Design a protein around this ligand. Structure first.
Ligand SMILES: [Zn+2]
Length: 184
């Protein structure tokens, strides 16, 4: 953690965008990061975080990203454009922290593409997402193009083509409309 890639079956299993997702008990989070140091060309980082429950380093993937980012990456004077591609939308605790962080470090911008909405009808969860939309962060649902990109960048794909599951696009529309509605 951060790993450079997922296995194929972990990707197809954990990023499938069904409404009833049994039992994806982990969250996975791919990221790209455009590091804009100030008198230098742009550089890029790329990775994958899984949530942790070992000994005493419990973190949802979001916290691990943030702990890794602060401890090892955040630097004087440089700007950052982060993108996440996340299996599940964030719990409201995680969304809480992230929104703090953004408001506090305004040199960082954050886009979050999410494959699935955890409990989209519940307001504690809708709250998290509204909070993040407020502190700057874009929140989108992953569509076909985003799945293809993560396949091509975060998986040991053996150079094979992405193989979309049936229903991928339908699931995207259903979840998009739910997002639009939640973010009034
Ligand atoms: Zn969380």
């Amino acid at each position: 953690n951060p790993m450079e890639a997922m296995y194929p079956h972990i990707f197809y299993f954990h990023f499938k965008n069904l409404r009833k997702a049994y039992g994806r008990n982990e969250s996975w989070l791919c990221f790209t990061m455009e590091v804009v140091k100030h008198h230098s060309p742009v550089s890029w980082k790329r990775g994958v975080f899984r949530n942790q429950v070992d000994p005493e380093t419990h973190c949802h993937a979001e916290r691990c990203f943030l702990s890794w980012f602060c401890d090892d990456i955040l630097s004087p004077n440089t700007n950052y454009e982060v993108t996440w591609y996340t299996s599940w939308s964030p719990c409201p605790e995680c969304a809480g922290e992230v929104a703090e962080f953004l408001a506090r470090h305004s040199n960082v911008n954050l886009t979050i593409f999410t494959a699935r909405l955890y409990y989209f009808w519940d307001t504690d969860y809708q709250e998290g997402l509204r909070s993040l939309s407020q502190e700057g962060a874009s929140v989108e649902i992953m569509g076909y193009k985003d799945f293809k990109y993560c396949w091509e960048n975060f998986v040991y794909n053996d150079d094979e083509p992405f193989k979309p599951w049936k229903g991928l696009k339908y699931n995207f529309l259903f979840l998009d409309s739910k997002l639009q509605e939640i973010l009034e």
